[PDB]
Structure formats: C-alpha cells, structure tokens
Amino acid sequence: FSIAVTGATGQLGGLVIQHLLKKVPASQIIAIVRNVEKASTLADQGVEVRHGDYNQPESLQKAFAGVSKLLFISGPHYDNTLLIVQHANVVKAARDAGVKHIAYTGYAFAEESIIPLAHVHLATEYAIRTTNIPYTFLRNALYTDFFVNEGLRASTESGAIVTNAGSGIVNSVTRNELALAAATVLTEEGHENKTYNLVSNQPWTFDELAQILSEVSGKKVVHQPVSFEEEKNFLVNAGVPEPFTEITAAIYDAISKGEASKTSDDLQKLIGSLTPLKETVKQALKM
Amino acid sequence: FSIAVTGATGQLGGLVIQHLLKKVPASQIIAIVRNVEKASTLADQGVEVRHGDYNQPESLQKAFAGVSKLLFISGPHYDNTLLIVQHANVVKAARDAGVKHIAYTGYAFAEESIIPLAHVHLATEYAIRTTNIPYTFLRNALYTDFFVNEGLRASTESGAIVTNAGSGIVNSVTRNELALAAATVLTEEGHENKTYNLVSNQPWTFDELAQILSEVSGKKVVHQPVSFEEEKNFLVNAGVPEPFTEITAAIYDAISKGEASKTSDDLQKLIGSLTPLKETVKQALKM
Ligand SMILES: NC(=O)c1ccc[n+]([C@@H]2O[C@H](COP(=O)([O-])OP(=O)(O)OC[C@H]3O[C@@H](n4cnc5c(N)ncnc54)[C@H](OP(=O)(O)O)[C@@H]3O)[C@@H](O)[C@H]2O)c1
Ligand SMILES: NC(=O)c1ccc[n+]([C@@H]2O[C@H](COP(=O)([O-])OP(=O)(O)OC[C@H]3O[C@@H](n4cnc5c(N)ncnc54)[C@H](OP(=O)(O)O)[C@@H]3O)[C@@H](O)[C@H]2O)c1
C-alpha cells in the first residue's frame, strides 16, 4: 500500500520521492503538495499528486484519504506559533483519515536545543503521540547544504568564510542522506514507535570547512570569526535581506554554544557510510 | 491591568474567579466563555464577560484583545487530538493579541505520565514556549473532587468503595485549592517563566478513604479491590454510561501503576496549609 509525502515539491520532499522511486513502483507513491502546478515534474514520473495545504483542514482530510504510510515533512518556519497550528491540523487530518503509520521530520536532540524551532518539533511529536498511530520520529540534523552550497564561490573569491560560530562543532548531514533515511524507513519493517537522531558521527568546524575549501579550490580560504552583530552586518552588506541575515547569525550563534555538537550512530546504521564533507564541497562547487 | 480566565463557567474557572474577586476589583477580571448565557451569574458580580470559543480563532482574537494576563484553562478532553488543535488556536490567538503573561493549567509530572492526556498538556506547554510570552505552567494534580463527592453516599449505603486502584497512591488536590493557586499566581510577582507541580504532599490510598468515610459516616465501609474489567462492569451496572465507566477504570488503573504517586511542596508553598482529606469527605457528604 501507499506512501504519501507532504512538502513533496520542496527540496527534502523531492529527494525523498526520488529515493522512493528506486525502491517502490511510482504508482505506490503519493505527492501531497500545496501548489499542484509545481508538481508537474512528479506526475510525469507516474507519481500521484494530491492537493494538501496545512492551512486547509478539508484539503488534508481528502489528501490523506486511504493512505497507509504518511511522511509528514515539517512546514517552512517563519512563524513558529503559526507552524504549531498548521502541524496540529496535519496530525488531526492524519488521525481522521485513519493513516496507519506516520513518520515526522523533527529536529535531533530537540530537548537540549536552544533555538525556538525545537519547541515546534517537540509540540508536534507530542501531537502525533495523542493519535495512537505507530510513529517514526526522524529527528534531522541541520542541513550541511545550508553551509556548503554554490554560495561558497563567494568565499573562494574573497579568501574568507565569515561566521560567528567560533569553533562550534557541526553534526550536519546533507538533505540527500536525510531523504535516503526517510525513504529507507518508509520501505522496511521495524521502525514503528521509534525515535532516531539523524546526525553525523564525523562532525566538523568552520576552520575545517575553510581548509577543505582551500584544498578543493586551490585558493587559500580562512575562517574569519566575528561577533553576532558583525555577522548580521557583513551579510546585509553582501545582499542578504535583514530577516535571513538575522536567522543565519542566530544559527551560527547557537552553533558557537554547542547546538549541533552532539552525535549519534542512528543515521549511519540506517543508511550505511556517510558522505565525506569534502565530497559535498566538491559537488557544491562542481570541483 | 486585566486578568482573563478561559473556561470561566466551568468548575475550576468559576472557582478561580471567586478567588480573584477576593483579591482584585471585579472590573479587572474578564470571564472568557463559550456560552454567554451561562455567564449571567458572573456579569451580576461586575465581571466582564467575553465570548471565546476554542473552535473559533476569530472569537479568540477578539476575546484576548487588550488582556494583560491570561489564565488558559485546558479544554474538556474527550478527543485528545482535537484538543491539541483547540489549544494551538488558543496559543496563537494569545500571541496575536499581544497577551503579556500566560498561565496554563497543565498536568503534574506529565513527562512521567502513562495516560494519553499528558501528551496534550506537554504539546500545549511547548506551543506556549514558541510565543515568547512569559508563562506559568500550573501543572495540576488529579482533582480530589473526582473521587470524593456526594456520590460517596452510594458507598456509605453499600458498605464498599469499589475500585481497580489497588494500593495505588493518590496525590490529588481539590479544585478549590488549585483555583486558589491559580488566583495567587495571577495576582503577585515572581512566577514568570516557572513550572509548578501542584499536588499534595500528604497522599492517600483508597483503603484510607474507606477508613475516613467509615469514621465520618459511622458506617463500616471497606475498599473492595477488583480488576479493570470488573470495575468497568460494576460501574455500568450502577448506571455509569460505558464511555465514562471506561475512563474511570482507566484512571484507577493508572493510579494502581503509580500515576499519582509523586509529590511536591510547590502547592503548599504557594497557598499555605492544604485541606485534610477528612474535611473534604465531610463537605462532600455534608457530615
Ligand atoms: N534541519 C534543517 O537545517 C532545516 C532547515 C530548513 C528547514 N528545515 C525543515 O525541513 C523542512 C524541509 O526542508 P526543505 O529544504 O525541503 O524545505 P523547502 O524546500 O523550503 O520546502 C518546504 C515545503 O513546505 C511546503 N509548504 C509551505 N507552506 C505550506 C502549506 N501552507 N501547506 C502545505 N505545504 C506547505 C512548501 O511547498 P511549496 O512548494 O508550495 O512552497 C515546500 O514544499 C522545512 O519545511 C523545514 O521545516 C530544516
Ligand atoms: N486534573 C484533573 O483531575 C482533571 C479532570 C478533568 C478535567 N481536567 C481539566 O481541567 C479543566 C478544568 O476542569 P473543570 O472541572 O473546571 O472542567 P469543566 O467544569 O468540565 O469545564 C470545562 C470548561 O471548558 C469549556 N469549554 C468546552 N469546550 C469549549 C470550547 N470549544 N471553547 C471554549 N470553552 C470550552 C466549558 O465551557 P461550557 O460551560 O460552555 O461547556 C467549561 O467551562 C478541564 O477542561 C480539563 O481539561 C482536569
């Protein structure tokens, strides 16, 4: 029976579907999406598309009708209090539709977290627990892709990666590997009523990232450590709009305080060997 | 400035208002209610009544308009998954209205609890945390009134209190004392960003309750211990409808497993001496 993926046109959701397509027939996968025009790509691959908007309880009732396994990918997180309402609507719709298994993309080590979004994930986990639906909490790390992407070309150019993270440790993993973990979990037995903290057991620092970028690119790049307020200003000056520049500085600050410093073998046990940071840097730069 | 109480026509809410009326002028209190006709009694006392229905986000936006301190009393708990949605609507309405302080009636020791409703309370606490509003989590014990009420006359008549609680320990406190604690907290400094586990530090067993009922009434009453299924059937046979009889047996079963067996001095520190169980038995029976 069927596997449905919310957030299916998003980056993580699209990768989950691409991994599911290597495991199950396309007819067995259901893409649940807010913008049905966006999901054209998917329909061509033989994946059924349904409209499901977290702001619209009725739309979710219909989208979840008859689905056996649901991958509930968390919403974009501008307004955390709104996100709780949206997530609560999703869980109730899932309960009402008689969904037989629910997997939820949470946040690793949320109980120890110092960023506000951890609260949303824990509230959502408790909401799913009230349903009595067999669950899997896929507690994802921060995305390596947030830090390691084509944007690093700017750092190759300037000779510096500028952050306020200090020597904060980073347990990030790529969206690709987190998507693979979600797909693996959805398509095999044994993961009912389990929580996984899906993080790297080979963490890195920004010093290390600069050294790897230096190695790959041939240009000397240093990590240049600055204050929170120096970071916010550096980013705005580089054309990052003030809200996102604030979010980025806040994530670096949490990192400087150990936010991403805890590890687990859960991910490696689920999917096998993890992608070395250097390979991700090479891909990001196509170098 | 103003203190608003949701669930104001309910048993706990009405007692909070009666305690607030001994501390602050009636004009400073706002009763927020679903059924405005029910709140006639309150309006006669000079308490402002507003319509606020947890199913109606717009109604809550208007009810919370301009309120400084909000006592969010949890909804009735038939459907736990629906309750999460309702509670999420309340918290968002409170955030949007710019409520300056939120107190929430949660459940003591919820993290260790084995009843499903604990999950709702923890989800709601995490929701309130996302707002950044200064909070007080008034984590209430089970109500002594659930077990000790006029219904005990039936036990005086039969010579038996019949439960499936065994020798399970009970840390219950009366609605009256929990309401007093809520009112105390609302009307003094120092309780911002605090969690209180509001329970008895003089717990009791059903054996003890039968002995106290025997003492007060002059008739020998024993505690007669039965199975879960024997309890459910005993209650239905005594005219308790099958859903409530199931809930009652489930609460006794949780008690037999230590659900209400943990204590704290938080309540006694907040309100002073606690009401002896024997005094509550006398009141319940007017004996
Ligand atoms: N761990 C991390 O470092 C990290 C970082 C960022 C986010 N996250 C979380 O992980 C999730 C997935 O990551 P991602 O990179 O795949 O995010 P993404 O590409 O931004 O995708 C977010 C998805 O949510 C959908 N969405 C937004 N509002 C919706 C609504 N009202 N109803 C239904 N769907 C809605 C979007 O659909 P549309 O295509 O219609 O816009 C999009 O498909 C995010 O939503 C976020 O909560 C994690
Ligand atoms: N710790 C315990 O042993 C225990 C036991 C039972 C309940 N509780 C919790 O503590 C709360 C208060 O206890 P209580 O004895 O005062 O309960 P209660 O007398 O049953 O009152 C519940 C209140 O919630 C209101 N309500 C129901 N649906 C609503 C809605 N959709 N929108 C707005 N208000 C709504 C009711 O209003 P109406 O008058 O309009 O019906 C009522 O005033 C309960 O709601 C429950 O969550 C605790």
CSV table of N, CA, C and O in Angstrom, one decimal, chain A residues 9-85:
chain,number,residue,atom,x,y,z
A,9,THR,N,7.1,19.0,-3.3
A,9,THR,CA,7.8,19.9,-4.2
A,9,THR,C,9.0,20.7,-3.6
A,9,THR,O,9.8,21.4,-4.2
A,10,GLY,N,9.2,20.5,-2.3
A,10,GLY,CA,10.3,21.1,-1.6
A,10,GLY,C,11.6,20.3,-1.8
A,10,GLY,O,11.5,19.2,-2.4
A,11,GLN,N,12.7,20.8,-1.3
A,11,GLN,CA,14.0,20.2,-1.6
A,11,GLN,C,14.1,18.8,-0.9
A,11,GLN,O,14.4,17.8,-1.6
A,12,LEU,N,13.7,18.7,0.3
A,12,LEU,CA,13.8,17.4,1.0
A,12,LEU,C,12.8,16.4,0.5
A,12,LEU,O,13.1,15.3,0.2
A,13,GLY,N,11.6,16.9,0.3
A,13,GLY,CA,10.4,16.1,-0.2
A,13,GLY,C,10.7,15.5,-1.6
A,13,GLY,O,10.4,14.3,-1.9
A,14,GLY,N,11.3,16.3,-2.5
A,14,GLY,CA,11.6,15.9,-3.9
A,14,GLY,C,12.7,14.8,-3.8
A,14,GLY,O,12.6,13.8,-4.6
A,15,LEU,N,13.6,14.9,-2.9
A,15,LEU,CA,14.7,13.9,-2.8
A,15,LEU,C,14.1,12.6,-2.2
A,15,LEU,O,14.6,11.5,-2.5
A,16,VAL,N,13.2,12.7,-1.3
A,16,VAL,CA,12.5,11.5,-0.7
A,16,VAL,C,11.8,10.7,-1.8
A,16,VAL,O,12.0,9.5,-1.9
A,17,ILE,N,11.1,11.4,-2.6
A,17,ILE,CA,10.4,10.8,-3.8
A,17,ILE,C,11.4,10.2,-4.7
A,17,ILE,O,11.1,9.1,-5.2
A,18,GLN,N,12.5,10.9,-5.0
A,18,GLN,CA,13.5,10.3,-5.9
A,18,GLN,C,14.1,9.0,-5.4
A,18,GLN,O,14.4,8.1,-6.1
A,19,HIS,N,14.4,9.0,-4.1
A,19,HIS,CA,14.8,7.8,-3.4
A,19,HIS,C,13.7,6.7,-3.3
A,19,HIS,O,14.1,5.5,-3.5
A,20,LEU,N,12.5,7.1,-3.1
A,20,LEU,CA,11.4,6.1,-3.1
A,20,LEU,C,11.2,5.4,-4.4
A,20,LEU,O,10.9,4.3,-4.5
A,21,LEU,N,11.4,6.2,-5.5
A,21,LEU,CA,11.3,5.7,-6.9
A,21,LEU,C,12.3,4.7,-7.2
A,21,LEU,O,12.1,3.9,-8.2
A,22,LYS,N,13.4,4.6,-6.4
A,22,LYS,CA,14.4,3.5,-6.6
A,22,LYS,C,14.0,2.3,-5.8
A,22,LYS,O,14.6,1.2,-5.8
A,23,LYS,N,12.9,2.4,-5.0
A,23,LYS,CA,12.5,1.3,-4.1
A,23,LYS,C,11.2,0.7,-4.3
A,23,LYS,O,10.9,-0.5,-4.1
A,24,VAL,N,10.2,1.5,-4.7
A,24,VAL,CA,8.8,1.1,-4.8
A,24,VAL,C,8.3,1.6,-6.2
A,24,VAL,O,8.8,2.6,-6.7
A,25,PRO,N,7.3,1.0,-6.8
A,25,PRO,CA,6.7,1.5,-8.0
A,25,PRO,C,6.1,2.9,-7.9
A,25,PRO,O,5.7,3.2,-6.8
A,26,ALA,N,6.2,3.7,-9.0
A,26,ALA,CA,5.8,5.1,-8.9
A,26,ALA,C,4.3,5.2,-8.5
A,26,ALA,O,3.9,6.2,-7.9
A,27,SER,N,3.5,4.2,-8.8
A,27,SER,CA,2.0,4.2,-8.5
A,27,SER,C,1.8,4.1,-7.0
A,27,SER,O,0.7,4.4,-6.5
A,28,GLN,N,2.8,3.7,-6.2
A,28,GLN,CA,2.6,3.4,-4.8
A,28,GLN,C,3.0,4.7,-4.0
A,28,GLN,O,2.7,4.8,-2.8
A,29,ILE,N,3.5,5.7,-4.7
A,29,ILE,CA,3.9,7.0,-4.0
A,29,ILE,C,2.9,8.0,-4.3
A,29,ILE,O,2.4,8.1,-5.4
A,30,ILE,N,2.5,8.9,-3.3
A,30,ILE,CA,1.6,10.0,-3.4
A,30,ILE,C,2.3,11.3,-3.0
A,30,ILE,O,2.7,11.4,-1.8
A,31,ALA,N,2.4,12.2,-3.9
A,31,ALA,CA,3.0,13.5,-3.6
A,31,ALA,C,1.8,14.4,-3.1
A,31,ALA,O,0.8,14.6,-3.8
A,32,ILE,N,2.0,14.9,-1.9
A,32,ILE,CA,1.0,15.8,-1.4
A,32,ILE,C,1.7,17.2,-1.3
A,32,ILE,O,2.8,17.4,-0.8
A,33,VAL,N,1.0,18.1,-2.0
A,33,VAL,CA,1.6,19.4,-2.3
A,33,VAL,C,0.6,20.6,-2.1
A,33,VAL,O,-0.6,20.4,-2.2
A,34,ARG,N,1.1,21.8,-1.9
A,34,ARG,CA,0.2,23.0,-1.8
A,34,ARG,C,-0.1,23.6,-3.2
A,34,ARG,O,-1.2,24.0,-3.5
A,35,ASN,N,0.9,23.5,-4.1
A,35,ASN,CA,0.9,24.1,-5.4
A,35,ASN,C,0.9,23.0,-6.4
A,35,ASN,O,2.0,22.4,-6.7
A,36,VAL,N,-0.3,22.6,-7.0
A,36,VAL,CA,-0.3,21.4,-7.9
A,36,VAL,C,0.3,21.6,-9.2
A,36,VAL,O,0.8,20.7,-9.8
A,37,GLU,N,0.4,22.9,-9.7
A,37,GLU,CA,1.1,23.2,-10.9
A,37,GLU,C,2.6,22.9,-10.8
A,37,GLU,O,3.2,22.4,-11.8
A,38,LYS,N,3.2,23.2,-9.7
A,38,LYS,CA,4.6,22.9,-9.3
A,38,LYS,C,4.9,21.4,-9.4
A,38,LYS,O,6.1,21.0,-9.7
A,39,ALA,N,3.9,20.5,-9.1
A,39,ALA,CA,4.1,19.1,-9.1
A,39,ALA,C,4.0,18.4,-10.4
A,39,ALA,O,3.9,17.1,-10.5
A,40,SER,N,4.0,19.1,-11.5
A,40,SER,CA,4.0,18.6,-12.9
A,40,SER,C,5.2,17.6,-13.2
A,40,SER,O,4.9,16.5,-13.6
A,41,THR,N,6.4,18.0,-12.8
A,41,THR,CA,7.6,17.2,-12.9
A,41,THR,C,7.3,15.7,-12.4
A,41,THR,O,7.6,14.7,-13.0
A,42,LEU,N,6.7,15.7,-11.2
A,42,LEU,CA,6.4,14.4,-10.4
A,42,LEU,C,5.4,13.6,-11.2
A,42,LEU,O,5.6,12.3,-11.2
A,43,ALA,N,4.3,14.2,-11.7
A,43,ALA,CA,3.2,13.5,-12.3
A,43,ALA,C,3.7,12.7,-13.6
A,43,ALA,O,3.2,11.7,-13.9
A,44,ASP,N,4.7,13.3,-14.3
A,44,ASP,CA,5.3,12.7,-15.4
A,44,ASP,C,6.1,11.4,-15.1
A,44,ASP,O,6.2,10.5,-16.0
A,45,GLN,N,6.5,11.3,-13.9
A,45,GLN,CA,7.2,10.1,-13.4
A,45,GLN,C,6.3,9.0,-12.9
A,45,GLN,O,6.7,7.9,-12.6
A,46,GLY,N,5.0,9.3,-13.0
A,46,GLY,CA,3.9,8.4,-12.6
A,46,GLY,C,3.5,8.4,-11.1
A,46,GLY,O,2.8,7.5,-10.6
A,47,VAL,N,4.0,9.5,-10.4
A,47,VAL,CA,3.6,9.7,-9.0
A,47,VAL,C,2.3,10.5,-9.0
A,47,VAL,O,2.2,11.5,-9.6
A,48,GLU,N,1.4,9.9,-8.2
A,48,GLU,CA,0.1,10.6,-8.0
A,48,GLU,C,0.2,11.9,-7.2
A,48,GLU,O,0.9,11.8,-6.1
A,49,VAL,N,-0.4,13.0,-7.6
A,49,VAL,CA,-0.3,14.3,-6.9
A,49,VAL,C,-1.6,14.5,-6.3
A,49,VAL,O,-2.7,14.4,-6.9
A,50,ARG,N,-1.6,15.0,-5.0
A,50,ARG,CA,-2.8,15.5,-4.4
A,50,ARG,C,-2.6,16.8,-3.8
A,50,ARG,O,-1.5,17.1,-3.3
A,51,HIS,N,-3.6,17.6,-3.7
A,51,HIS,CA,-3.5,18.9,-3.1
A,51,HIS,C,-3.7,18.8,-1.6
A,51,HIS,O,-4.7,18.2,-1.1
A,52,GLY,N,-2.8,19.3,-0.8
A,52,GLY,CA,-2.9,19.3,0.6
A,52,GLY,C,-2.2,20.5,1.1
A,52,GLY,O,-1.0,20.7,1.0
A,53,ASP,N,-3.0,21.4,1.7
A,53,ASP,CA,-2.4,22.7,2.3
A,53,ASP,C,-2.6,22.7,3.8
A,53,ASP,O,-3.8,22.5,4.3
A,54,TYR,N,-1.5,22.8,4.6
A,54,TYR,CA,-1.6,22.8,6.0
A,54,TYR,C,-2.5,23.8,6.7
A,54,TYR,O,-2.9,23.7,7.8
A,55,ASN,N,-2.8,24.8,5.9
A,55,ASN,CA,-3.8,25.9,6.3
A,55,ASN,C,-5.2,25.5,6.0
A,55,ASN,O,-6.1,26.2,6.5
A,56,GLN,N,-5.4,24.4,5.4
A,56,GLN,CA,-6.8,23.9,4.9
A,56,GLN,C,-7.1,22.5,5.4
A,56,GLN,O,-6.9,21.6,4.6
A,57,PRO,N,-7.7,22.4,6.6
A,57,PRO,CA,-8.0,21.0,7.1
A,57,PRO,C,-8.8,20.1,6.2
A,57,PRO,O,-8.6,18.9,6.2
A,58,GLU,N,-9.7,20.7,5.4
A,58,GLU,CA,-10.5,19.9,4.5
A,58,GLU,C,-9.7,19.3,3.4
A,58,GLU,O,-9.8,18.1,3.0
A,59,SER,N,-8.8,20.1,2.8
A,59,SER,CA,-7.8,19.7,1.8
A,59,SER,C,-7.0,18.5,2.3
A,59,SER,O,-6.7,17.6,1.6
A,60,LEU,N,-6.6,18.5,3.6
A,60,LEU,CA,-5.8,17.4,4.2
A,60,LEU,C,-6.6,16.2,4.4
A,60,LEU,O,-6.1,15.1,4.2
A,61,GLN,N,-7.8,16.3,4.9
A,61,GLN,CA,-8.7,15.2,5.0
A,61,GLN,C,-8.8,14.4,3.7
A,61,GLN,O,-8.6,13.1,3.7
A,62,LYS,N,-9.0,15.1,2.6
A,62,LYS,CA,-9.1,14.4,1.3
A,62,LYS,C,-7.7,13.9,0.8
A,62,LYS,O,-7.7,12.8,0.3
A,63,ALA,N,-6.6,14.6,1.0
A,63,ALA,CA,-5.3,14.2,0.6
A,63,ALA,C,-4.8,12.9,1.3
A,63,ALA,O,-4.2,12.0,0.7
A,64,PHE,N,-5.2,12.8,2.6
A,64,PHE,CA,-4.8,11.6,3.4
A,64,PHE,C,-5.7,10.4,3.3
A,64,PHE,O,-5.4,9.4,3.9
A,65,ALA,N,-6.8,10.6,2.6
A,65,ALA,CA,-7.9,9.6,2.4
A,65,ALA,C,-7.2,8.3,1.9
A,65,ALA,O,-6.6,8.3,0.8
A,66,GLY,N,-7.3,7.2,2.7
A,66,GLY,CA,-6.8,6.0,2.2
A,66,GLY,C,-5.3,5.8,2.2
A,66,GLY,O,-4.8,4.7,1.7
A,67,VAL,N,-4.5,6.7,2.7
A,67,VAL,CA,-3.0,6.5,2.7
A,67,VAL,C,-2.6,5.6,3.9
A,67,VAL,O,-3.1,5.8,5.1
A,68,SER,N,-1.7,4.6,3.6
A,68,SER,CA,-1.2,3.7,4.6
A,68,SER,C,-0.1,4.3,5.4
A,68,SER,O,-0.2,4.4,6.7
A,69,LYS,N,0.9,4.8,4.8
A,69,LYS,CA,2.1,5.4,5.4
A,69,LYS,C,2.2,6.9,5.0
A,69,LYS,O,2.3,7.2,3.8
A,70,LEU,N,2.3,7.8,6.0
A,70,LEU,CA,2.5,9.2,5.7
A,70,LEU,C,3.8,9.7,6.2
A,70,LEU,O,4.2,9.6,7.4
A,71,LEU,N,4.6,10.4,5.3
A,71,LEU,CA,5.8,11.1,5.7
A,71,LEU,C,5.3,12.6,5.8
A,71,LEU,O,5.1,13.3,4.8
A,72,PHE,N,5.3,13.1,7.0
A,72,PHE,CA,4.9,14.4,7.4
A,72,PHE,C,6.2,15.2,7.4
A,72,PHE,O,7.0,15.0,8.4
A,73,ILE,N,6.5,16.0,6.4
A,73,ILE,CA,7.7,16.8,6.4
A,73,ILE,C,7.3,18.2,7.0
A,73,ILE,O,6.2,18.7,6.5
A,74,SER,N,8.0,18.7,7.9
A,74,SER,CA,7.6,19.9,8.6
A,74,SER,C,7.5,21.1,7.7
A,74,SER,O,8.1,21.2,6.7
A,75,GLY,N,6.6,22.1,8.1
A,75,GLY,CA,6.4,23.3,7.2
A,75,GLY,C,7.6,24.2,7.3
A,75,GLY,O,8.5,24.1,8.2
A,76,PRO,N,7.7,25.2,6.4
A,76,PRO,CA,8.7,26.2,6.4
A,76,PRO,C,8.5,27.0,7.7
A,76,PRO,O,7.4,27.2,8.1
A,77,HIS,N,9.5,27.6,8.3
A,77,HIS,CA,9.4,28.0,9.6
A,77,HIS,C,9.6,29.5,10.0
A,77,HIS,O,10.4,29.8,10.8
A,78,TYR,N,8.8,30.3,9.3
A,78,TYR,CA,8.9,31.8,9.5
A,78,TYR,C,8.3,32.1,10.9
A,78,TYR,O,9.0,32.6,11.8
A,79,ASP,N,7.0,31.7,11.1
A,79,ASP,CA,6.3,32.0,12.3
A,79,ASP,C,6.0,30.6,13.0
A,79,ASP,O,5.3,29.8,12.6
A,80,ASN,N,6.8,30.4,14.1
A,80,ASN,CA,6.8,29.2,14.9
A,80,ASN,C,5.4,28.9,15.5
A,80,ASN,O,5.0,27.8,15.5
A,81,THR,N,4.7,29.9,15.9
A,81,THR,CA,3.4,29.7,16.6
A,81,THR,C,2.4,29.3,15.5
A,81,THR,O,1.5,28.5,15.8
A,82,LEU,N,2.4,30.0,14.3
A,82,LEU,CA,1.6,29.5,13.2
A,82,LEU,C,1.9,28.1,12.8
A,82,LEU,O,1.0,27.3,12.5
A,83,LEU,N,3.2,27.8,12.7
A,83,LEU,CA,3.6,26.4,12.4
A,83,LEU,C,3.0,25.3,13.3
A,83,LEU,O,2.6,24.2,12.9
A,84,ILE,N,2.8,25.6,14.6
A,84,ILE,CA,2.2,24.7,15.6
A,84,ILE,C,0.7,24.4,15.2
A,84,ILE,O,0.3,23.2,15.1
A,85,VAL,N,0.0,25.4,14.8
A,85,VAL,CA,-1.4,25.3,14.3
A,85,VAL,C,-1.4,24.5,13.1
A,85,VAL,O,-2.3,23.6,12.9
